[PDB]
Amino acid sequence: PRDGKDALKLLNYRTGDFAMIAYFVLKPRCLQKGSLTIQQVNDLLDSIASNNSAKRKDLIKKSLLQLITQSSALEQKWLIRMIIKDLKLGVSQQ
DNA sequence: CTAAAAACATTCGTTCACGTGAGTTCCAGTACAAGTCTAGTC
């Protein structure tokens, strides 16, 4: 719901990162065990990037829906962090 | 001559100063992670 607590929380994230809010929102909704391998995730991300380059948001929406429906809340949060390009695992790239 | 008063010699206990090995812990130093890097228009 656009006026539901989850919608405002996702939108009002003080532009405690967005990944944590998304994980909390998706916890009661998402499954407990995903079925996507690393190769499938990489293929979906590549498709999203290519469609963005080609200016076709329908395919981007379809790929995002597939990722959302075939992953768990932890997987959703990690995918969001990867897309944003901000992980902060506590260990530097070096 | 005589004993006695003074001086001298010895051993012990206590105090102190220094040196040194061992255990505990506190902290300066080091390593590492994360953020910043100019401001605006169109």
Coordinates of N, CA, C and O (backbone and C1' of nucleotides) in Angstrom, one line a residue:
Chain A
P1 N 0.8 -1.2 0.0 CA 0.0 0.0 0.0 C 0.9 1.3 0.0 O 1.8 1.4 0.8
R2 N 0.5 2.2 -0.9 CA 1.3 3.4 -1.0 C 1.3 4.2 0.4 O 2.3 4.8 0.7
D3 N 0.3 4.1 1.1 CA 0.2 4.7 2.4 C 0.5 3.7 3.6 O 0.5 4.1 4.7
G4 N 0.8 2.5 3.2 CA 1.2 1.5 4.3 C 2.6 1.8 4.8 O 3.5 2.4 4.2
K5 N 2.8 1.3 6.1 CA 4.0 1.6 6.8 C 5.2 1.2 6.0 O 6.2 2.0 5.9
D6 N 5.2 0.1 5.3 CA 6.3 -0.4 4.6 C 6.7 0.6 3.4 O 7.9 0.8 3.2
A7 N 5.7 1.1 2.7 CA 5.9 2.0 1.6 C 6.6 3.3 2.1 O 7.6 3.7 1.5
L8 N 6.1 3.9 3.1 CA 6.7 5.1 3.7 C 8.1 4.8 4.2 O 9.1 5.6 4.0
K9 N 8.3 3.7 4.8 CA 9.7 3.3 5.3 C 10.6 3.2 4.2 O 11.8 3.7 4.3
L10 N 10.2 2.5 3.1 CA 11.1 2.4 2.0 C 11.4 3.7 1.3 O 12.6 4.0 0.9
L11 N 10.4 4.5 1.1 CA 10.6 5.8 0.5 C 11.3 6.8 1.4 O 12.2 7.5 1.0
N12 N 10.9 6.8 2.7 CA 11.5 7.8 3.7 C 12.6 7.0 4.4 O 12.5 6.6 5.6
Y13 N 13.8 6.9 3.7 CA 15.0 6.2 4.3 C 16.0 7.2 4.6 O 17.2 6.9 4.7
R14 N 15.7 8.5 4.8 CA 16.6 9.6 5.2 C 17.7 9.7 4.1 O 18.9 9.5 4.3
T15 N 17.2 10.1 2.9 CA 18.1 10.3 1.7 C 19.3 11.2 2.1 O 20.4 10.7 2.3
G16 N 21.9 1.4 9.4 CA 20.6 1.9 9.0 C 20.5 2.3 7.6 O 19.9 3.3 7.3
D17 N 21.1 1.5 6.7 CA 21.1 1.8 5.3 C 19.8 1.3 4.6 O 19.0 0.6 5.3
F18 N 19.6 1.6 3.4 CA 18.4 1.1 2.7 C 18.3 -0.4 2.6 O 17.2 -1.0 2.6
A19 N 19.5 -1.1 2.6 CA 19.4 -2.5 2.5 C 18.8 -3.1 3.8 O 18.0 -4.1 3.7
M20 N 19.1 -2.6 5.0 CA 18.5 -3.1 6.2 C 17.0 -2.9 6.2 O 16.2 -3.8 6.6
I21 N 16.5 -1.7 5.7 CA 15.1 -1.4 5.7 C 14.4 -2.4 4.7 O 13.3 -2.9 5.0
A22 N 15.0 -2.6 3.6 CA 14.4 -3.6 2.6 C 14.4 -5.0 3.2 O 13.4 -5.7 3.0
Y23 N 15.4 -5.4 3.9 CA 15.5 -6.7 4.5 C 14.3 -6.9 5.5 O 13.6 -7.9 5.6
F24 N 14.1 -5.8 6.4 CA 13.1 -5.9 7.4 C 11.7 -5.9 6.7 O 10.8 -6.7 7.1
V25 N 11.5 -5.2 5.6 CA 10.3 -5.2 4.9 C 10.0 -6.5 4.3 O 8.9 -7.1 4.3
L26 N 11.0 -7.1 3.7 CA 10.8 -8.4 2.9 C 10.9 -9.6 3.8 O 10.5 -10.7 3.4
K27 N 11.3 -9.5 5.1 CA 11.4 -10.7 6.0 C 10.1 -11.4 6.1 O 10.0 -12.6 5.9
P28 N 8.9 -10.8 6.4 CA 7.7 -11.5 6.5 C 7.1 -12.0 5.1 O 6.2 -12.8 5.1
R29 N 7.6 -11.5 4.0 CA 7.1 -11.8 2.7 C 7.9 -12.8 2.0 O 7.4 -13.7 1.3
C30 N 9.2 -12.7 2.0 CA 10.1 -13.5 1.2 C 10.1 -14.9 1.7 O 9.7 -15.2 2.9
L31 N 10.7 -15.8 0.9 CA 10.8 -17.2 1.3 C 11.9 -17.4 2.3 O 12.7 -16.5 2.6
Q32 N 12.1 -18.7 2.7 CA 13.2 -19.0 3.6 C 14.4 -19.6 2.9 O 15.5 -19.7 3.4
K33 N 14.3 -20.0 1.6 CA 15.3 -20.7 0.9 C 15.2 -20.3 -0.6 O 14.2 -20.6 -1.2
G34 N 16.2 -19.7 -1.2 CA 16.2 -19.3 -2.6 C 16.6 -20.4 -3.5 O 16.9 -21.5 -3.0
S35 N 16.5 -20.1 -4.8 CA 16.8 -21.2 -5.8 C 17.7 -20.6 -6.9 O 17.7 -21.2 -8.0
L36 N 18.4 -19.5 -6.7 CA 19.1 -18.8 -7.8 C 20.6 -19.0 -7.5 O 21.1 -18.8 -6.4
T37 N 21.3 -19.5 -8.5 CA 22.8 -19.7 -8.4 C 23.5 -18.4 -8.7 O 22.9 -17.4 -9.2
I38 N 24.8 -18.4 -8.5 CA 25.6 -17.1 -8.8 C 25.5 -16.8 -10.3 O 25.4 -15.6 -10.7
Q39 N 25.6 -17.8 -11.2 CA 25.5 -17.6 -12.6 C 24.2 -16.9 -13.0 O 24.2 -16.0 -13.8
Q40 N 23.1 -17.4 -12.5 CA 21.8 -16.8 -12.8 C 21.7 -15.4 -12.3 O 21.2 -14.5 -13.0
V41 N 22.2 -15.1 -11.1 CA 22.2 -13.7 -10.6 C 23.1 -12.8 -11.5 O 22.6 -11.7 -11.8
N42 N 24.2 -13.3 -11.9 CA 25.1 -12.5 -12.8 C 24.4 -12.2 -14.1 O 24.5 -11.1 -14.7
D43 N 23.7 -13.2 -14.7 CA 23.0 -13.1 -15.9 C 21.9 -12.1 -15.8 O 21.7 -11.2 -16.7
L44 N 21.1 -12.1 -14.7 CA 20.1 -11.2 -14.5 C 20.6 -9.7 -14.3 O 20.0 -8.8 -14.9
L45 N 21.7 -9.6 -13.6 CA 22.3 -8.2 -13.5 C 22.8 -7.7 -14.8 O 22.6 -6.5 -15.1
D46 N 23.4 -8.6 -15.6 CA 23.9 -8.2 -16.9 C 22.7 -7.8 -17.8 O 22.8 -6.8 -18.6
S47 N 21.6 -8.5 -17.7 CA 20.4 -8.2 -18.5 C 19.9 -6.8 -18.1 O 19.5 -6.0 -18.9
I48 N 19.8 -6.6 -16.8 CA 19.3 -5.3 -16.3 C 20.2 -4.2 -16.8 O 19.7 -3.1 -17.3
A49 N 21.5 -4.3 -16.7 CA 22.5 -3.3 -17.2 C 22.3 -3.1 -18.7 O 22.2 -1.9 -19.2
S50 N 22.2 -4.1 -19.5 CA 22.1 -4.0 -20.9 C 20.8 -3.3 -21.3 O 20.7 -2.4 -22.2
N51 N 19.7 -3.7 -20.6 CA 18.4 -3.0 -20.9 C 18.4 -1.5 -20.5 O 17.8 -0.7 -21.2
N52 N 19.1 -1.2 -19.4 CA 19.3 0.2 -19.0 C 20.0 0.9 -20.1 O 19.7 2.1 -20.4
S53 N 21.1 0.3 -20.6 CA 21.8 0.9 -21.7 C 20.9 1.1 -23.0 O 21.0 2.1 -23.7
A54 N 20.1 0.2 -23.2 CA 19.2 0.2 -24.4 C 17.9 0.9 -24.1 O 17.0 1.0 -25.0
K55 N 17.7 1.5 -22.9 CA 16.5 2.2 -22.6 C 15.2 1.4 -22.8 O 14.4 1.7 -23.6
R56 N 15.1 0.3 -22.0 CA 14.0 -0.6 -22.0 C 13.7 -1.0 -20.6 O 14.3 -2.0 -20.1
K57 N 12.8 -0.3 -19.9 CA 12.6 -0.5 -18.5 C 11.7 -1.7 -18.2 O 11.7 -2.2 -17.1
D58 N 11.0 -2.2 -19.2 CA 10.1 -3.3 -19.0 C 10.9 -4.6 -18.6 O 10.6 -5.3 -17.7
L59 N 12.0 -4.8 -19.4 CA 12.9 -6.0 -19.1 C 13.6 -5.8 -17.7 O 13.7 -6.8 -17.0
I60 N 13.9 -4.6 -17.4 CA 14.5 -4.3 -16.1 C 13.5 -4.7 -15.0 O 13.9 -5.3 -14.0
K61 N 12.3 -4.3 -15.1 CA 11.2 -4.6 -14.2 C 11.0 -6.1 -14.1 O 10.9 -6.6 -13.0
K62 N 11.0 -6.8 -15.2 CA 10.8 -8.2 -15.2 C 12.0 -8.9 -14.5 O 11.7 -9.8 -13.7
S63 N 13.2 -8.5 -14.8 CA 14.3 -9.1 -14.1 C 14.3 -8.9 -12.6 O 14.6 -9.8 -11.8
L64 N 14.0 -7.6 -12.2 CA 13.9 -7.3 -10.8 C 12.8 -8.1 -10.1 O 13.0 -8.6 -9.0
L65 N 11.7 -8.3 -10.8 CA 10.6 -9.1 -10.2 C 11.1 -10.6 -10.0 O 10.8 -11.2 -9.0
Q66 N 11.8 -11.1 -11.0 CA 12.3 -12.5 -11.0 C 13.2 -12.6 -9.8 O 13.1 -13.6 -9.0
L67 N 14.2 -11.7 -9.6 CA 15.1 -11.7 -8.5 C 14.4 -11.6 -7.2 O 14.7 -12.4 -6.2
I68 N 13.4 -10.8 -7.1 CA 12.6 -10.6 -5.8 C 11.9 -11.9 -5.5 O 11.9 -12.4 -4.3
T69 N 11.3 -12.5 -6.5 CA 10.4 -13.7 -6.2 C 11.2 -15.0 -6.1 O 10.7 -16.0 -5.6
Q70 N 12.5 -15.0 -6.5 CA 13.4 -16.2 -6.4 C 14.6 -16.0 -5.5 O 15.7 -16.3 -5.9
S71 N 14.4 -15.3 -4.4 CA 15.4 -15.1 -3.4 C 14.8 -14.8 -2.0 O 13.7 -14.5 -1.9
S72 N 15.7 -15.0 -1.0 CA 15.3 -14.8 0.4 C 15.7 -13.4 0.8 O 16.5 -12.7 0.2
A73 N 15.1 -12.9 1.9 CA 15.3 -11.6 2.4 C 16.8 -11.2 2.5 O 17.2 -10.1 2.1
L74 N 17.6 -12.2 3.0 CA 19.0 -11.9 3.1 C 19.6 -11.8 1.7 O 20.4 -10.9 1.4
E75 N 19.2 -12.6 0.7 CA 19.6 -12.5 -0.6 C 19.2 -11.2 -1.2 O 19.9 -10.6 -2.0
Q76 N 17.9 -10.7 -0.9 CA 17.5 -9.4 -1.4 C 18.4 -8.3 -0.9 O 18.7 -7.4 -1.7
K77 N 18.7 -8.3 0.4 CA 19.5 -7.3 0.9 C 20.9 -7.3 0.3 O 21.5 -6.2 -0.1
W78 N 21.5 -8.5 0.1 CA 22.8 -8.5 -0.5 C 22.8 -8.1 -2.0 O 23.7 -7.4 -2.4
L79 N 21.7 -8.5 -2.7 CA 21.6 -8.0 -4.1 C 21.5 -6.5 -4.1 O 22.0 -5.9 -5.0
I80 N 20.7 -5.9 -3.2 CA 20.5 -4.5 -3.2 C 21.9 -3.8 -2.9 O 22.2 -2.8 -3.6
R81 N 22.7 -4.3 -2.0 CA 24.0 -3.8 -1.7 C 24.9 -3.9 -2.9 O 25.6 -3.0 -3.2
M82 N 24.9 -5.0 -3.6 CA 25.7 -5.2 -4.8 C 25.3 -4.2 -5.9 O 26.2 -3.6 -6.5
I83 N 24.0 -4.0 -6.1 CA 23.5 -3.1 -7.1 C 24.0 -1.7 -6.8 O 24.4 -0.9 -7.6
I84 N 23.8 -1.3 -5.5 CA 24.3 0.0 -5.1 C 25.8 0.2 -5.1 O 26.3 1.3 -5.0
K85 N 26.5 -1.0 -5.1 CA 28.0 -1.0 -5.1 C 28.5 -0.4 -3.8 O 29.3 0.4 -3.7
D86 N 27.9 -1.0 -2.7 CA 28.3 -0.6 -1.3 C 28.0 -1.8 -0.4 O 26.9 -2.0 0.0
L87 N 29.1 -2.5 -0.1 CA 29.0 -3.7 0.8 C 29.4 -3.5 2.2 O 28.7 -3.7 3.2
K88 N 30.7 -3.0 2.4 CA 31.2 -2.7 3.7 C 31.2 -4.0 4.6 O 30.6 -4.1 5.6
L89 N 32.0 -5.0 4.1 CA 32.1 -6.3 4.8 C 33.0 -6.2 6.1 O 33.1 -7.1 6.8
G90 N 33.7 -5.1 6.3 CA 34.6 -4.9 7.3 C 36.0 -5.3 7.0 O 37.0 -5.0 7.8
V91 N 36.3 -5.8 5.8 CA 37.6 -6.1 5.2 C 37.8 -5.3 4.0 O 36.9 -5.3 3.1
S92 N 38.9 -4.6 3.9 CA 39.1 -3.7 2.7 C 39.4 -4.6 1.5 O 39.7 -5.8 1.5
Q93 N 39.3 -3.9 0.3 CA 39.6 -4.6 -1.0 C 41.0 -5.2 -0.9 O 41.3 -6.2 -1.5
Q94 N 42.0 -4.4 -0.3 CA 43.3 -4.9 -0.3 C 43.4 -6.2 0.5 O 44.1 -7.2 0.1
Chain B
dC1 P 103.9 -8.8 95.2 O5' 102.5 -8.3 95.8 C5' 102.2 -6.9 95.8 C4' 100.7 -6.7 96.2 C3' 99.7 -7.2 95.3 O3' 98.6 -7.9 96.0 C1' 99.3 -4.9 95.5
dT2 P 97.5 -8.7 95.3 O5' 96.2 -8.5 96.1 C5' 95.9 -7.3 96.8 C4' 94.9 -6.4 96.1 C3' 94.2 -7.1 94.9 O3' 93.0 -7.8 95.3 C1' 94.6 -4.7 94.7
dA3 P 92.0 -8.3 94.2 O5' 91.0 -7.1 94.0 C5' 90.5 -6.4 95.1 C4' 89.9 -5.0 94.7 C3' 88.7 -5.2 93.7 O3' 87.7 -4.2 94.1 C1' 90.4 -4.0 92.6
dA4 P 86.3 -4.2 93.3 O5' 86.4 -2.9 92.3 C5' 86.7 -1.7 92.9 C4' 87.0 -0.6 91.8 C3' 85.9 -0.6 90.7 O3' 85.8 0.8 90.2 C1' 88.0 -1.1 89.7
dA5 P 84.3 1.4 89.9 O5' 84.6 2.5 88.8 C5' 85.7 3.4 89.0 C4' 86.4 3.7 87.6 C3' 85.5 3.8 86.4 O3' 85.7 5.0 85.8 C1' 87.2 2.2 86.0
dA6 P 84.7 5.5 84.6 O5' 85.6 5.2 83.3 C5' 86.9 5.8 83.1 C4' 87.7 5.1 82.1 C3' 87.1 5.0 80.7 O3' 87.8 5.9 79.8 C1' 88.0 2.9 81.4
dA7 P 87.3 6.1 78.3 O5' 88.1 4.9 77.5 C5' 89.5 4.7 77.6 C4' 89.9 3.4 76.9 C3' 89.4 3.2 75.5 O3' 90.5 3.0 74.6 C1' 88.9 1.3 76.9
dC8 P 90.2 2.9 73.0 O5' 90.1 1.3 72.7 C5' 91.1 0.5 73.1 C4' 90.8 -1.0 72.9 C3' 90.1 -1.3 71.5 O3' 90.9 -2.2 70.8 C1' 88.9 -2.2 73.3
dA9 P 90.5 -2.7 69.4 O5' 89.7 -4.1 69.6 C5' 90.3 -5.1 70.4 C4' 89.5 -6.4 70.4 C3' 88.8 -6.7 69.0 O3' 88.8 -8.1 68.8 C1' 87.2 -6.4 70.7
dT10 P 88.3 -8.7 67.4 O5' 87.2 -9.8 67.8 C5' 86.3 -9.5 68.9 C4' 85.2 -10.5 68.9 C3' 84.5 -10.8 67.6 O3' 84.1 -12.2 67.6 C1' 83.0 -9.6 69.1
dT11 P 83.5 -12.8 66.2 O5' 81.9 -12.8 66.5 C5' 81.4 -13.5 67.6 C4' 79.9 -13.2 67.9 C3' 79.0 -13.3 66.7 O3' 77.9 -14.2 66.9 C1' 78.7 -11.2 67.7
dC12 P 77.0 -14.7 65.8 O5' 75.7 -13.8 65.9 C5' 74.9 -13.9 67.1 C4' 74.0 -12.7 67.2 C3' 73.0 -12.5 66.1 O3' 71.7 -12.9 66.5 C1' 74.0 -10.4 66.7
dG13 P 70.5 -13.0 65.4 O5' 69.9 -11.5 65.4 C5' 69.4 -10.9 66.6 C4' 68.8 -9.6 66.4 C3' 67.9 -9.4 65.2 O3' 66.7 -8.7 65.5 C1' 69.7 -7.9 65.0
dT14 P 65.6 -8.5 64.4 O5' 65.7 -7.0 63.9 C5' 65.8 -6.0 64.8 C4' 66.2 -4.7 64.1 C3' 65.4 -4.4 62.8 O3' 64.9 -3.1 62.9 C1' 67.8 -4.2 62.4
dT15 P 63.8 -2.6 61.8 O5' 64.7 -1.7 60.8 C5' 65.5 -0.6 61.3 C4' 66.4 0.0 60.3 C3' 65.7 0.2 58.9 O3' 65.7 1.6 58.6 C1' 67.9 -0.9 58.7
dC16 P 65.0 2.1 57.2 O5' 66.1 2.0 56.1 C5' 67.4 2.7 56.4 C4' 68.3 2.5 55.2 C3' 67.6 2.5 53.8 O3' 68.4 3.3 52.9 C1' 68.9 0.5 54.1
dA17 P 67.8 3.7 51.5 O5' 69.0 4.4 50.7 C5' 70.4 4.0 51.0 C4' 70.9 2.9 49.9 C3' 70.0 2.9 48.7 O3' 70.8 3.5 47.6 C1' 70.6 0.7 49.5
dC18 P 70.2 3.5 46.1 O5' 70.7 2.1 45.5 C5' 72.1 1.7 45.7 C4' 72.4 0.4 45.1 C3' 71.7 0.1 43.7 O3' 72.7 -0.2 42.8 C1' 71.3 -1.7 45.3
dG19 P 72.3 -0.4 41.2 O5' 72.1 -2.0 41.0 C5' 73.2 -2.8 41.4 C4' 72.8 -4.3 41.2 C3' 72.0 -4.6 40.0 O3' 72.6 -5.6 39.2 C1' 70.9 -5.4 41.9
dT20 P 72.1 -6.0 37.8 O5' 71.0 -7.2 38.1 C5' 71.4 -8.3 38.9 C4' 70.2 -9.3 39.0 C3' 69.3 -9.4 37.8 O3' 69.1 -10.7 37.5 C1' 68.0 -8.9 39.7
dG21 P 68.6 -11.1 36.0 O5' 67.4 -12.1 36.2 C5' 67.6 -13.3 37.0 C4' 66.3 -13.9 37.5 C3' 65.2 -14.1 36.4 O3' 64.5 -15.3 36.5 C1' 64.4 -12.7 38.1
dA22 P 63.5 -15.8 35.4 O5' 62.0 -15.4 36.1 C5' 61.7 -16.0 37.3 C4' 60.3 -15.6 37.7 C3' 59.3 -15.5 36.6 O3' 58.0 -16.1 37.0 C1' 59.4 -13.4 37.7
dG23 P 56.9 -16.5 35.9 O5' 55.7 -15.6 36.3 C5' 55.1 -15.7 37.6 C4' 54.2 -14.6 37.9 C3' 53.1 -14.3 36.8 O3' 51.8 -14.2 37.4 C1' 54.3 -12.3 37.3
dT24 P 50.5 -14.1 36.5 O5' 50.1 -12.6 36.5 C5' 49.8 -11.9 37.7 C4' 49.6 -10.4 37.5 C3' 48.6 -10.1 36.4 O3' 47.6 -9.3 36.9 C1' 50.6 -8.8 36.1
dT25 P 46.3 -8.9 36.0 O5' 46.7 -7.4 35.4 C5' 47.0 -6.4 36.2 C4' 47.4 -5.1 35.5 C3' 46.5 -4.8 34.3 O3' 46.4 -3.4 34.1 C1' 48.7 -5.1 33.5
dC26 P 45.2 -2.6 34.7 O5' 45.5 -1.0 34.3 C5' 46.7 -0.5 34.7 C4' 47.6 0.0 33.5 C3' 46.8 0.7 32.4 O3' 46.8 2.1 32.5 C1' 48.6 -0.7 31.6
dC27 P 46.1 3.0 31.4 O5' 47.3 3.2 30.2 C5' 48.6 3.5 30.6 C4' 49.6 3.5 29.4 C3' 49.0 4.3 28.2 O3' 50.0 5.0 27.6 C1' 49.5 2.0 27.6
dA28 P 49.7 6.3 26.7 O5' 50.8 6.2 25.5 C5' 52.2 6.2 25.9 C4' 53.1 5.5 24.9 C3' 53.0 6.2 23.5 O3' 54.3 6.1 22.9 C1' 52.0 4.0 23.4
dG29 P 54.6 6.8 21.5 O5' 54.4 5.6 20.4 C5' 55.3 4.4 20.6 C4' 54.8 3.3 19.8 C3' 54.5 3.6 18.3 O3' 55.4 2.9 17.5 C1' 52.7 2.4 19.2
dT30 P 55.5 3.2 15.9 O5' 54.5 2.1 15.2 C5' 54.7 0.8 15.5 C4' 53.5 -0.1 15.1 C3' 53.1 0.1 13.6 O3' 53.4 -1.0 12.8 C1' 51.2 0.0 15.2
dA31 P 53.1 -1.0 11.3 O5' 51.7 -1.6 11.1 C5' 51.4 -2.8 11.7 C4' 49.9 -3.1 11.6 C3' 49.3 -2.9 10.2 O3' 48.7 -4.1 9.7 C1' 48.0 -1.8 11.9
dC32 P 48.2 -4.2 8.2 O5' 46.7 -3.8 8.2 C5' 45.8 -4.4 9.1 C4' 44.5 -3.7 9.2 C3' 43.9 -3.3 7.8 O3' 42.6 -3.9 7.6 C1' 43.8 -1.5 9.4
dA33 P 41.8 -3.6 6.3 O5' 40.6 -2.7 6.7 C5' 39.7 -3.1 7.8 C4' 38.6 -2.1 7.9 C3' 37.9 -1.6 6.6 O3' 36.5 -1.5 6.8 C1' 38.9 0.2 7.8
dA34 P 35.6 -1.2 5.6 O5' 35.3 0.4 5.7 C5' 34.7 0.9 6.9 C4' 34.6 2.4 6.8 C3' 34.1 3.0 5.5 O3' 33.1 3.9 5.7 C1' 36.2 4.0 6.2
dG35 P 32.3 4.5 4.4 O5' 32.8 6.0 4.4 C5' 32.7 6.8 5.6 C4' 33.3 8.2 5.5 C3' 33.0 8.9 4.1 O3' 32.6 10.2 4.4 C1' 35.3 8.8 4.4
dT36 P 32.1 11.1 3.1 O5' 33.4 11.9 2.7 C5' 34.1 12.8 3.7 C4' 35.2 13.5 3.1 C3' 34.9 14.1 1.7 O3' 35.1 15.5 1.6 C1' 36.9 12.9 1.7
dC37 P 34.4 16.4 0.5 O5' 35.5 16.6 -0.6 C5' 36.8 17.2 -0.3 C4' 37.8 16.9 -1.4 C3' 37.3 17.1 -2.8 O3' 38.1 18.1 -3.4 C1' 38.5 15.1 -2.6
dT38 P 37.6 18.8 -4.8 O5' 36.5 19.8 -4.3 C5' 36.8 20.9 -3.4 C4' 35.9 22.1 -3.5 C3' 34.4 21.8 -3.3 O3' 33.8 22.9 -2.6 C1' 34.7 22.4 -5.6
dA39 P 32.3 22.9 -2.2 O5' 31.5 23.4 -3.4 C5' 31.7 24.8 -3.8 C4' 30.9 25.1 -5.1 C3' 29.5 24.5 -5.2 O3' 28.5 25.5 -4.9 C1' 30.7 24.3 -7.3
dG40 P 27.0 25.2 -4.9 O5' 26.5 25.4 -6.5 C5' 26.8 26.7 -7.0 C4' 26.7 26.6 -8.6 C3' 25.4 26.1 -9.1 O3' 24.5 27.2 -9.3 C1' 27.2 25.3 -10.4
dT41 P 23.0 27.0 -9.8 O5' 23.2 26.8 -11.4 C5' 23.8 27.8 -12.2 C4' 23.9 27.4 -13.6 C3' 22.6 27.0 -14.3 O3' 22.3 27.9 -15.4 C1' 24.3 25.3 -14.7
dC42 P 20.9 28.0 -16.1 O5' 20.8 26.7 -17.1 C5' 21.7 26.7 -18.2 C4' 21.6 25.3 -18.9 C3' 20.2 24.7 -19.0 O3' 19.7 25.0 -20.3 C1' 21.8 23.1 -18.4

